[PDB]
Amino acid sequence: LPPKLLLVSFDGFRADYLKNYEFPHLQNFIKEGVLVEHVKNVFITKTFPNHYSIVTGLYEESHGIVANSMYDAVTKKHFSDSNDKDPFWWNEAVPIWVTNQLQENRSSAAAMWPGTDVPIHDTISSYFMNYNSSVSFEERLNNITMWLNNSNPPVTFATLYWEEPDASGHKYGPEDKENMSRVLKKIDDLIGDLVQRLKMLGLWENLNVIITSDHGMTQCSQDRLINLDSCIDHSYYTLIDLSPVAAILPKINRTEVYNKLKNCSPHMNVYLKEDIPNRFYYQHNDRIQPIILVADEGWTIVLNESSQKLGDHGYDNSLPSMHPFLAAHGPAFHKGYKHSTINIVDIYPMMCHILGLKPHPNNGTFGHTKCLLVDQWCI
Ligand SMILES: *[C@@H]1O[C@H](CO)[C@@H](O[C@@H]2O[C@H](CO)[C@@H](O)[C@H](O)[C@H]2NC(C)=O)[C@H](O)[C@H]1NC(C)=O
Ligand SMILES: Nc1ncnc2c1ncn2[C@@H]1O[C@H](COP(=O)(O)O)[C@@H](O)[C@H]1O
Ligand SMILES: *[C@@H]1O[C@H](CO)[C@@H](O)[C@H](O)[C@H]1NC(C)=O
Ligand SMILES: *[C@@H]1O[C@H](CO)[C@@H](O)[C@H](O)[C@H]1NC(C)=O
Ligand SMILES: [Zn+2]
Ligand SMILES: [Zn+2]
């Protein structure tokens, strides 16, 4: 009987949601498991880059998914959330489902996790779902758990992904407590459905389950806008990604573009690529454009017609508002332990340890996770 692990992400689950709303089902999951109250994720704090960091243990400059929208000047290739199936974009790293799939008599399974419908280094999970946001949580849940329960050879690593509370966090903004409370109650119910389902199938006691997320959300406002069209003409540059980290590809002298942009708003930092702060680990990749604009927390970079979005993320990964949480339950995990923080790149070496996989070189520190694990010294 090999170890099994289910990795679950509810997109956009800001850590402090746990302190401001009631999560009876999550509380239950935590009570007999472990909670990391907030996870320091990676810059930029967007969906595709952070999900890949979870499954590779790498910073974004290293795994190469540096935004939800990218342009590679050399190949002329474009990446976006919808247009995300060219392996070119995934192949700078090897995610854990691949390493798991490559072991004899083991399989990986997936239900909607970013990249799991793409062959990466020519390897795809035995079971996966082509991305389709219309597929209900129940269907994702019932299928991924069936696969974990049945399947020959055994499924030992599985992913499960859900688009909320990110989608509604964007719509309402995290400060809209009336509306976010209904969103998050639904998430807690889904976690309840997950636990009920594990108990029904007899998986609850032997399956390792991690419930986590990619980033948080912060409130945006009409009083906090930076309009690039009021600062620089379109002819000067091509916009690769917009807000709150704008990726700017100059059409003319980069110096001329930089001089305009650095005098646009005191509520963003304007960086030549080579001046991007080292703390972000967001420089050493050709997919990072010659200039980036980083808006301060709660500020939005806009064009004349950019639509309103009351919540957003992407900002500085040191901001608590951008941090997700992590919870876990199962034979590898202690019962009733709470820990303050780990880094999101630390999840990978922990998962490899649970599954008995040799990790690829990575930027995580296994030591940070030892207090969560039953076989490990906790200092
Ligand atoms: C994050 O981990 C990656 C993987 O080990 C590191 O990437 C290496 O970087 C060194 C630079 O010292 C290169 O010589 C290696 O060839 C790289 N290896 C791979 C597989 O990319 C990266 O340096 C780490 N990041 C930090 C900030 O330490
Ligand atoms: N495979 C996929 N294809 C298309 N869209 C996706 C996929 N996975 C996630 N998404 C959506 O893309 C969003 C990324 O935008 P953001 O949340 O602003 O980072 C996610 O929150 C999902 O709603
Ligand atoms: C879920 O599983 C059913 C049968 O168990 C399968 O027919 C269906 O295609 C799956 N849904 C997906 C892959 O979205
Ligand atoms: C997405 O899922 C829904 C529900 O299963 C289905 O009706 C729809 O046809 C799917 N879209 C594609 C492109 O398969
Ligand atoms: Zn996300
Ligand atoms: Zn989002």
CSV table of C-alpha atoms and ligand atoms in Angstrom, one decimal:
chain,number,residue,atom,x,y,z
A,1,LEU,CA,0.0,0.0,0.0
A,2,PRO,CA,1.8,3.1,-1.3
A,3,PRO,CA,1.2,6.6,0.3
A,4,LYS,CA,-1.5,8.6,-1.5
A,5,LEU,CA,-1.9,12.4,-1.6
A,6,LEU,CA,-4.8,14.6,-2.8
A,7,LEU,CA,-3.9,18.3,-3.4
A,8,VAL,CA,-6.9,20.6,-3.4
A,9,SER,CA,-6.9,24.3,-4.4
A,10,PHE,CA,-9.7,26.7,-4.0
A,11,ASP,CA,-8.6,29.6,-6.1
A,12,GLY,CA,-8.1,33.0,-4.4
A,13,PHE,CA,-8.6,31.9,-0.8
A,14,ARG,CA,-7.1,34.8,1.2
A,15,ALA,CA,-5.6,33.5,4.5
A,16,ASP,CA,-7.5,35.9,6.8
A,17,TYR,CA,-10.8,34.8,5.4
A,18,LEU,CA,-10.4,32.1,8.1
A,19,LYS,CA,-10.5,34.8,10.8
A,20,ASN,CA,-13.4,36.8,9.5
A,21,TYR,CA,-16.0,34.1,8.5
A,22,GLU,CA,-17.3,30.8,9.9
A,23,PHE,CA,-15.9,27.6,8.4
A,24,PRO,CA,-17.4,24.8,10.4
A,25,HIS,CA,-16.4,22.1,7.9
A,26,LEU,CA,-12.9,23.4,7.4
A,27,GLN,CA,-12.6,23.8,11.2
A,28,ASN,CA,-13.4,20.1,11.5
A,29,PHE,CA,-10.9,19.1,8.9
A,30,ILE,CA,-8.3,21.2,10.7
A,31,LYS,CA,-9.2,19.9,14.2
A,32,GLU,CA,-7.7,16.5,13.5
A,33,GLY,CA,-5.1,17.7,11.1
A,34,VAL,CA,-2.8,20.7,10.6
A,35,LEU,CA,-3.2,24.3,9.7
A,36,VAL,CA,-0.6,26.7,8.3
A,37,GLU,CA,-2.3,30.1,9.0
A,38,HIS,CA,-0.7,31.9,6.1
A,39,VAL,CA,1.6,30.9,3.3
A,40,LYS,CA,4.0,33.3,1.7
A,41,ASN,CA,3.4,32.8,-2.0
A,42,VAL,CA,5.4,34.1,-5.0
A,43,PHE,CA,5.5,37.3,-7.1
A,44,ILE,CA,3.6,37.9,-9.2
A,45,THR,CA,0.7,36.7,-7.1
A,46,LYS,CA,-1.4,35.4,-10.0
A,47,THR,CA,-3.1,32.0,-10.6
A,48,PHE,CA,-1.0,30.2,-13.2
A,49,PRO,CA,2.4,31.2,-11.7
A,50,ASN,CA,1.5,30.2,-8.2
A,51,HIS,CA,-0.2,26.9,-9.0
A,52,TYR,CA,3.0,25.9,-10.8
A,53,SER,CA,5.1,27.0,-7.9
A,54,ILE,CA,3.1,24.7,-5.6
A,55,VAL,CA,3.8,21.7,-7.8
A,56,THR,CA,7.4,22.5,-8.7
A,57,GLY,CA,8.8,24.2,-5.6
A,58,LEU,CA,10.3,26.9,-7.9
A,59,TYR,CA,10.2,30.6,-8.1
A,60,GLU,CA,8.5,32.0,-11.2
A,61,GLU,CA,11.7,33.1,-12.9
A,62,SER,CA,12.8,29.5,-12.7
A,63,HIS,CA,9.7,27.5,-13.7
A,64,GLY,CA,8.9,30.1,-16.4
A,65,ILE,CA,5.2,30.7,-15.9
A,66,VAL,CA,5.7,34.3,-14.9
A,67,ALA,CA,2.1,35.6,-15.5
A,68,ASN,CA,-1.3,34.5,-16.7
A,69,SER,CA,-0.6,36.3,-20.0
A,70,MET,CA,2.9,36.0,-21.5
A,71,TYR,CA,4.7,36.8,-24.8
A,72,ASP,CA,7.9,35.1,-25.9
A,73,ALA,CA,9.6,37.6,-28.3
A,74,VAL,CA,11.9,35.0,-29.8
A,75,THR,CA,9.4,32.3,-30.8
A,76,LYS,CA,6.6,34.9,-31.1
A,77,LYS,CA,4.4,32.6,-29.0
A,78,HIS,CA,1.6,33.9,-26.8
A,79,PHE,CA,0.2,32.3,-23.6
A,80,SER,CA,-3.0,33.1,-21.8
A,81,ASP,CA,-5.3,31.3,-19.4
A,82,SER,CA,-7.4,29.9,-22.3
A,83,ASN,CA,-4.5,29.6,-24.7
A,84,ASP,CA,-2.4,27.6,-22.3
A,85,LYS,CA,-1.9,24.2,-24.0
A,86,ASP,CA,1.5,24.6,-25.8
A,87,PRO,CA,4.0,22.5,-23.8
A,88,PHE,CA,6.6,25.2,-24.6
A,89,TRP,CA,5.2,27.2,-21.7
A,90,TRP,CA,5.3,24.4,-19.1
A,91,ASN,CA,8.5,22.7,-20.0
A,92,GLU,CA,11.0,24.8,-18.1
A,93,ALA,CA,10.1,22.7,-15.0
A,94,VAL,CA,8.8,19.3,-14.1
A,95,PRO,CA,5.7,19.3,-11.9
A,96,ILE,CA,5.1,16.6,-9.2
A,97,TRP,CA,2.3,14.8,-11.1
A,98,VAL,CA,4.9,14.0,-13.8
A,99,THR,CA,7.5,12.6,-11.4
A,100,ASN,CA,4.8,10.6,-9.8
A,101,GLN,CA,3.4,9.3,-13.1
A,102,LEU,CA,6.9,8.1,-14.1
A,103,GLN,CA,7.3,5.7,-11.2
A,104,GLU,CA,6.5,2.0,-11.9
A,105,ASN,CA,3.0,0.9,-10.8
A,106,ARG,CA,1.9,4.4,-9.9
A,107,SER,CA,-0.5,6.9,-11.5
A,108,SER,CA,-1.4,10.5,-11.2
A,109,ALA,CA,-4.9,11.9,-11.6
A,110,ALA,CA,-6.3,15.4,-12.1
A,111,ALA,CA,-9.5,17.4,-11.9
A,112,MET,CA,-9.0,20.8,-13.5
A,113,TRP,CA,-5.7,21.9,-12.0
A,114,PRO,CA,-3.7,24.3,-14.2
A,115,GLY,CA,-1.5,22.4,-16.7
A,116,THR,CA,-2.8,19.0,-15.9
A,117,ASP,CA,-4.4,18.7,-19.3
A,118,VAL,CA,-1.1,19.5,-21.0
A,119,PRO,CA,1.7,16.9,-21.7
A,120,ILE,CA,4.8,18.2,-20.0
A,121,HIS,CA,8.1,16.6,-20.9
A,122,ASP,CA,5.9,14.2,-22.9
A,123,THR,CA,4.1,13.0,-19.8
A,124,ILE,CA,0.4,13.4,-18.9
A,125,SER,CA,-1.5,12.0,-15.9
A,126,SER,CA,-3.3,8.7,-16.4
A,127,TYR,CA,-6.5,10.5,-15.6
A,128,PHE,CA,-7.3,14.1,-16.2
A,129,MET,CA,-10.0,16.5,-17.2
A,130,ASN,CA,-9.7,18.9,-20.1
A,131,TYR,CA,-10.3,22.3,-18.5
A,132,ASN,CA,-13.9,23.3,-18.4
A,133,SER,CA,-15.1,25.7,-15.7
A,134,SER,CA,-18.7,24.6,-16.2
A,135,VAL,CA,-18.0,21.1,-14.6
A,136,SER,CA,-19.6,21.1,-11.2
A,137,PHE,CA,-17.5,20.6,-8.0
A,138,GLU,CA,-19.5,17.4,-7.3
A,139,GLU,CA,-18.3,15.9,-10.6
A,140,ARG,CA,-14.7,17.0,-10.0
A,141,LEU,CA,-14.9,15.6,-6.5
A,142,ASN,CA,-16.7,12.3,-7.2
A,143,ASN,CA,-14.3,11.5,-10.1
A,144,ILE,CA,-11.1,12.4,-8.4
A,145,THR,CA,-12.0,10.4,-5.3
A,146,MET,CA,-13.2,7.4,-7.4
A,147,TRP,CA,-9.8,7.5,-9.2
A,148,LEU,CA,-8.0,7.6,-5.8
A,149,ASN,CA,-10.2,4.8,-4.5
A,150,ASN,CA,-10.2,2.4,-7.5
A,151,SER,CA,-7.6,2.5,-10.3
A,152,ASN,CA,-5.0,-0.1,-11.2
A,153,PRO,CA,-2.1,0.7,-11.0
A,154,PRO,CA,-3.0,2.8,-7.8
A,155,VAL,CA,-3.5,6.6,-8.1
A,156,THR,CA,-1.0,8.0,-5.6
A,157,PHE,CA,-1.1,11.7,-6.5
A,158,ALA,CA,-4.2,13.6,-7.4
A,159,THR,CA,-5.1,17.3,-8.0
A,160,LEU,CA,-8.5,19.0,-7.5
A,161,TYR,CA,-9.2,22.6,-8.5
A,162,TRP,CA,-12.1,25.0,-8.0
A,163,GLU,CA,-12.5,28.6,-9.4
A,164,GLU,CA,-14.0,30.1,-6.2
A,165,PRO,CA,-13.6,32.1,-4.1
A,166,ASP,CA,-11.4,33.9,-6.6
A,167,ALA,CA,-14.1,34.6,-9.2
A,168,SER,CA,-16.5,36.2,-6.8
A,169,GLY,CA,-13.7,37.9,-4.9
A,170,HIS,CA,-13.0,39.7,-8.1
A,171,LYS,CA,-16.7,40.6,-8.6
A,172,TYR,CA,-17.5,41.9,-5.1
A,173,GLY,CA,-14.1,42.7,-3.6
A,174,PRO,CA,-13.0,41.1,-0.3
A,175,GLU,CA,-14.4,43.9,1.7
A,176,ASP,CA,-18.0,43.2,0.7
A,177,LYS,CA,-18.7,41.0,3.7
A,178,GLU,CA,-22.3,40.4,2.9
A,179,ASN,CA,-21.6,38.9,-0.5
A,180,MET,CA,-18.3,37.3,0.3
A,181,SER,CA,-19.8,35.5,3.3
A,182,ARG,CA,-22.2,33.6,0.9
A,183,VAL,CA,-19.3,32.8,-1.4
A,184,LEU,CA,-17.2,31.4,1.4
A,185,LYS,CA,-20.0,29.5,3.0
A,186,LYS,CA,-20.4,27.7,-0.3
A,187,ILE,CA,-16.6,26.9,-0.2
A,188,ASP,CA,-17.0,25.5,3.4
A,189,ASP,CA,-19.9,23.4,2.2
A,190,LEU,CA,-17.8,22.0,-0.6
A,191,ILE,CA,-15.1,21.1,1.9
A,192,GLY,CA,-17.8,19.4,3.8
A,193,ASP,CA,-18.7,17.5,0.7
A,194,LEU,CA,-15.1,16.5,0.2
A,195,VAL,CA,-14.8,15.1,3.8
A,196,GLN,CA,-18.2,13.4,3.6
A,197,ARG,CA,-17.1,11.8,0.3
A,198,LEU,CA,-13.8,10.6,1.7
A,199,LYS,CA,-15.6,9.1,4.7
A,200,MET,CA,-18.2,7.4,2.5
A,201,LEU,CA,-15.5,5.8,0.3
A,202,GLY,CA,-13.3,4.8,3.3
A,203,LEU,CA,-10.5,7.2,2.3
A,204,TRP,CA,-10.7,9.6,5.2
A,205,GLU,CA,-8.3,7.8,7.5
A,206,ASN,CA,-5.6,6.7,5.0
A,207,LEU,CA,-5.5,9.4,2.3
A,208,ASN,CA,-3.3,12.5,2.8
A,209,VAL,CA,-5.2,15.6,1.8
A,210,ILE,CA,-3.9,19.1,1.4
A,211,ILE,CA,-6.4,22.0,1.0
A,212,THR,CA,-4.7,25.2,0.0
A,213,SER,CA,-4.8,28.0,-2.6
A,214,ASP,CA,-2.6,30.2,-4.8
A,215,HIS,CA,-3.1,33.8,-3.5
A,216,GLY,CA,-5.5,36.1,-1.8
A,217,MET,CA,-7.4,39.2,-2.9
A,218,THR,CA,-7.5,42.9,-2.0
A,219,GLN,CA,-10.0,45.7,-2.6
A,220,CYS,CA,-9.8,48.0,-5.6
A,221,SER,CA,-11.5,51.3,-6.1
A,222,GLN,CA,-12.3,54.1,-8.6
A,223,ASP,CA,-10.2,56.3,-6.3
A,224,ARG,CA,-7.1,54.1,-6.9
A,225,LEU,CA,-6.6,54.0,-10.6
A,226,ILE,CA,-3.5,54.6,-12.7
A,227,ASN,CA,-4.5,55.2,-16.4
A,228,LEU,CA,-1.6,54.4,-18.7
A,229,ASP,CA,-3.3,56.2,-21.6
A,230,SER,CA,-3.0,59.4,-19.6
A,231,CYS,CA,0.7,58.8,-19.2
A,232,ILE,CA,2.0,57.3,-22.5
A,233,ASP,CA,0.8,56.9,-26.1
A,234,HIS,CA,0.1,53.4,-27.4
A,235,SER,CA,2.6,53.8,-30.2
A,236,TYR,CA,5.5,53.6,-27.6
A,237,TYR,CA,4.8,50.1,-26.4
A,238,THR,CA,3.0,46.8,-26.5
A,239,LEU,CA,1.1,45.8,-23.4
A,240,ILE,CA,1.7,42.1,-22.6
A,241,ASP,CA,-0.2,42.0,-19.2
A,242,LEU,CA,-2.1,44.8,-17.5
A,243,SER,CA,-2.8,44.9,-13.7
A,244,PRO,CA,-1.5,45.1,-11.1
A,245,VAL,CA,1.8,44.1,-12.6
A,246,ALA,CA,2.0,45.5,-16.1
A,247,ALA,CA,4.4,43.9,-18.6
A,248,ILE,CA,5.6,46.5,-21.0
A,249,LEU,CA,7.4,45.8,-24.3
A,250,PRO,CA,8.8,49.0,-25.7
A,251,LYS,CA,8.3,49.7,-29.4
A,252,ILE,CA,10.8,52.5,-29.3
A,253,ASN,CA,13.9,53.5,-27.1
A,254,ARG,CA,13.3,51.7,-23.8
A,255,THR,CA,14.8,54.8,-22.1
A,256,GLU,CA,12.1,57.0,-23.6
A,257,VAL,CA,9.3,54.6,-22.5
A,258,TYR,CA,10.9,54.3,-19.0
A,259,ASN,CA,11.1,58.1,-18.6
A,260,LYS,CA,7.4,58.6,-19.3
A,261,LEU,CA,6.3,55.6,-17.2
A,262,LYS,CA,8.5,56.5,-14.2
A,263,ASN,CA,6.7,59.9,-14.0
A,264,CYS,CA,3.1,58.6,-14.3
A,265,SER,CA,1.9,57.8,-10.7
A,266,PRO,CA,3.5,57.7,-7.2
A,267,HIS,CA,1.3,54.7,-6.6
A,268,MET,CA,3.3,52.3,-8.6
A,269,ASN,CA,7.0,51.3,-8.9
A,270,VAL,CA,8.4,51.3,-12.4
A,271,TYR,CA,11.3,48.9,-12.9
A,272,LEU,CA,13.7,48.2,-15.7
A,273,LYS,CA,13.9,44.4,-15.8
A,274,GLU,CA,17.4,44.5,-14.4
A,275,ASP,CA,16.2,46.7,-11.4
A,276,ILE,CA,13.4,44.4,-10.4
A,277,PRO,CA,13.9,43.8,-6.6
A,278,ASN,CA,15.8,40.6,-5.9
A,279,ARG,CA,13.3,39.7,-3.2
A,280,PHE,CA,10.8,38.9,-5.9
A,281,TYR,CA,12.9,36.2,-7.7
A,282,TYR,CA,11.4,37.7,-10.9
A,283,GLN,CA,14.3,38.7,-13.2
A,284,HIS,CA,16.0,35.7,-14.7
A,285,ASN,CA,13.7,34.6,-17.5
A,286,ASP,CA,13.3,35.8,-21.1
A,287,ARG,CA,9.5,35.8,-20.6
A,288,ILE,CA,9.8,38.8,-18.3
A,289,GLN,CA,9.5,42.0,-20.4
A,290,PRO,CA,12.0,44.9,-20.5
A,291,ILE,CA,9.9,47.1,-18.1
A,292,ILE,CA,7.4,46.1,-15.4
A,293,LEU,CA,5.0,48.3,-13.5
A,294,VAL,CA,4.0,47.2,-10.0
A,295,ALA,CA,1.0,48.9,-8.5
A,296,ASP,CA,0.8,49.5,-4.8
A,297,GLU,CA,-1.7,47.3,-2.9
A,298,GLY,CA,-5.3,48.1,-3.9
A,299,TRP,CA,-4.3,50.2,-6.9
A,300,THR,CA,-5.3,49.2,-10.5
A,301,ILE,CA,-3.5,49.9,-13.7
A,302,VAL,CA,-6.0,50.7,-16.4
A,303,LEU,CA,-6.5,51.7,-20.0
A,304,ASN,CA,-9.3,54.0,-21.1
A,305,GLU,CA,-11.9,51.1,-21.4
A,306,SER,CA,-10.6,48.6,-18.9
A,307,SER,CA,-13.6,47.1,-17.0
A,308,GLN,CA,-14.0,47.6,-13.3
A,309,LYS,CA,-12.9,44.8,-11.0
A,310,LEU,CA,-13.5,45.4,-7.3
A,311,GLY,CA,-11.1,42.7,-6.1
A,312,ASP,CA,-7.7,41.9,-7.5
A,313,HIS,CA,-4.4,40.1,-6.8
A,314,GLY,CA,-0.9,40.0,-8.4
A,315,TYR,CA,0.6,42.5,-5.9
A,316,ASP,CA,3.8,42.2,-3.8
A,317,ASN,CA,3.9,38.7,-2.3
A,318,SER,CA,4.9,40.1,1.1
A,319,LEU,CA,1.4,41.6,1.5
A,320,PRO,CA,-0.8,39.5,3.9
A,321,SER,CA,-3.8,40.2,1.6
A,322,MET,CA,-2.0,38.1,-1.1
A,323,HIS,CA,-1.3,35.1,1.0
A,324,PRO,CA,-3.3,31.8,0.9
A,325,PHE,CA,-3.5,29.3,3.8
A,326,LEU,CA,-2.7,25.6,3.9
A,327,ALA,CA,-4.5,22.9,5.8
A,328,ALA,CA,-3.9,19.1,5.8
A,329,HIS,CA,-5.2,15.8,7.1
A,330,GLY,CA,-4.1,12.3,6.9
A,331,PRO,CA,-1.6,9.6,8.2
A,332,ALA,CA,1.4,11.8,7.3
A,333,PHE,CA,0.1,14.8,9.3
A,334,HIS,CA,-0.2,15.6,13.0
A,335,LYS,CA,-3.6,16.0,14.6
A,336,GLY,CA,-4.6,19.4,16.1
A,337,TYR,CA,-1.4,21.3,15.2
A,338,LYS,CA,-1.3,24.9,14.0
A,339,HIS,CA,1.7,26.6,12.5
A,340,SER,CA,2.2,30.3,11.6
A,341,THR,CA,3.7,30.2,8.1
A,342,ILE,CA,5.6,28.3,5.4
A,343,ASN,CA,6.6,29.5,1.9
A,344,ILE,CA,4.6,28.2,-1.0
A,345,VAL,CA,7.8,26.7,-2.5
A,346,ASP,CA,8.1,24.5,0.6
A,347,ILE,CA,5.0,22.5,-0.3
A,348,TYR,CA,6.8,20.6,-3.1
A,349,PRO,CA,9.6,19.0,-1.1
A,350,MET,CA,7.0,18.1,1.6
A,351,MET,CA,4.8,16.4,-1.0
A,352,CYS,CA,7.7,14.5,-2.5
A,353,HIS,CA,8.7,13.3,1.0
A,354,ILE,CA,5.1,12.1,1.7
A,355,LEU,CA,5.0,10.2,-1.6
A,356,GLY,CA,8.6,8.9,-1.5
A,357,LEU,CA,9.6,10.8,-4.6
A,358,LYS,CA,13.0,12.3,-5.4
A,359,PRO,CA,12.4,16.0,-5.7
A,360,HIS,CA,13.9,18.0,-8.6
A,361,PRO,CA,16.2,20.8,-7.6
A,362,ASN,CA,13.9,23.5,-6.1
A,363,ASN,CA,13.8,26.6,-4.0
A,364,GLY,CA,11.8,25.2,-1.1
A,365,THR,CA,13.0,24.4,2.4
A,366,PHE,CA,11.7,21.0,3.6
A,367,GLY,CA,12.7,22.1,7.2
A,368,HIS,CA,9.9,24.7,7.2
A,369,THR,CA,7.3,21.9,7.0
A,370,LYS,CA,8.7,19.4,9.5
A,371,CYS,CA,6.3,20.4,12.3
A,372,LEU,CA,3.4,19.3,10.1
A,373,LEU,CA,4.6,15.8,9.6
A,374,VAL,CA,4.3,12.8,12.0
A,375,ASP,CA,7.7,11.2,11.1
A,376,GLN,CA,9.7,14.4,11.6
A,377,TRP,CA,11.5,16.3,14.4
A,378,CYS,CA,9.6,19.5,15.3
A,379,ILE,CA,11.8,22.3,16.7
B,1,LIG,C1,15.8,28.1,-7.4
B,1,LIG,O1,16.1,26.7,-7.8
B,1,LIG,C2,16.6,26.6,-9.1
B,1,LIG,C3,16.7,25.1,-9.3
B,1,LIG,O2,17.9,24.6,-8.6
B,1,LIG,C4,17.9,27.3,-9.3
B,1,LIG,O3,18.2,27.3,-10.7
B,1,LIG,C5,19.6,27.1,-10.9
B,1,LIG,O4,20.3,28.4,-10.8
B,1,LIG,C6,21.7,28.2,-10.9
B,1,LIG,C7,22.3,29.6,-10.6
B,1,LIG,O5,23.2,29.6,-9.5
B,1,LIG,C8,22.1,27.6,-12.3
B,1,LIG,O6,23.5,27.5,-12.4
B,1,LIG,C9,21.4,26.3,-12.4
B,1,LIG,O7,21.7,25.8,-13.7
B,1,LIG,C10,19.9,26.4,-12.2
B,1,LIG,N1,19.3,25.1,-12.3
B,1,LIG,C11,18.0,25.0,-12.8
B,1,LIG,C12,17.5,23.6,-12.8
B,1,LIG,O8,17.3,25.9,-13.2
B,1,LIG,C13,17.7,28.8,-8.9
B,1,LIG,O9,19.0,29.5,-8.9
B,1,LIG,C14,17.1,28.9,-7.5
B,1,LIG,N2,16.8,30.3,-7.2
B,1,LIG,C15,17.4,31.0,-6.2
B,1,LIG,C16,17.1,32.4,-6.0
B,1,LIG,O10,18.3,30.4,-5.4
B,2,LIG,N1,-7.0,25.8,-17.6
B,2,LIG,C1,-7.6,27.0,-17.6
B,2,LIG,N2,-8.0,27.6,-18.7
B,2,LIG,C2,-8.7,28.8,-18.7
B,2,LIG,N3,-8.8,29.5,-17.6
B,2,LIG,C3,-8.4,29.0,-16.4
B,2,LIG,C4,-7.7,27.7,-16.3
B,2,LIG,N4,-7.4,27.5,-15.0
B,2,LIG,C5,-7.9,28.6,-14.3
B,2,LIG,N5,-8.5,29.5,-15.1
B,2,LIG,C6,-9.0,30.8,-14.7
B,2,LIG,O1,-8.1,31.8,-14.9
B,2,LIG,C7,-8.0,32.6,-13.8
B,2,LIG,C8,-6.7,33.4,-13.7
B,2,LIG,O2,-6.9,34.7,-13.5
B,2,LIG,P1,-6.5,35.4,-12.1
B,2,LIG,O3,-7.4,34.7,-11.1
B,2,LIG,O4,-6.8,36.9,-12.2
B,2,LIG,O5,-5.1,34.9,-11.8
B,2,LIG,C9,-8.3,31.7,-12.6
B,2,LIG,O6,-8.7,32.3,-11.4
B,2,LIG,C10,-9.4,30.8,-13.3
B,2,LIG,O7,-10.7,31.4,-13.2
B,3,LIG,C1,-16.5,11.9,-14.4
B,3,LIG,O1,-16.6,10.5,-14.3
B,3,LIG,C2,-17.6,9.9,-15.2
B,3,LIG,C3,-17.8,8.5,-14.9
B,3,LIG,O2,-17.2,8.2,-13.6
B,3,LIG,C4,-17.0,10.2,-16.6
B,3,LIG,O3,-17.9,9.5,-17.6
B,3,LIG,C5,-17.0,11.7,-16.9
B,3,LIG,O4,-16.5,11.9,-18.2
B,3,LIG,C6,-16.1,12.3,-15.8
B,3,LIG,N1,-16.1,13.8,-15.9
B,3,LIG,C7,-15.2,14.6,-16.4
B,3,LIG,C8,-13.9,13.8,-16.9
B,3,LIG,O5,-15.3,15.8,-16.5
B,4,LIG,C1,-18.2,22.1,-20.4
B,4,LIG,O1,-19.0,21.3,-19.4
B,4,LIG,C2,-20.4,21.4,-19.6
B,4,LIG,C3,-21.0,20.6,-18.4
B,4,LIG,O2,-20.4,19.3,-18.4
B,4,LIG,C4,-20.8,20.8,-21.0
B,4,LIG,O3,-22.2,21.0,-21.1
B,4,LIG,C5,-20.0,21.6,-22.0
B,4,LIG,O4,-20.3,21.0,-23.3
B,4,LIG,C6,-18.5,21.5,-21.8
B,4,LIG,N1,-17.8,22.2,-22.8
B,4,LIG,C7,-16.9,21.6,-23.6
B,4,LIG,C8,-16.2,22.5,-24.6
B,4,LIG,O5,-16.7,20.4,-23.6
B,5,ZN,ZN,-5.8,32.2,-8.6
B,6,ZN,ZN,-8.1,36.0,-9.8
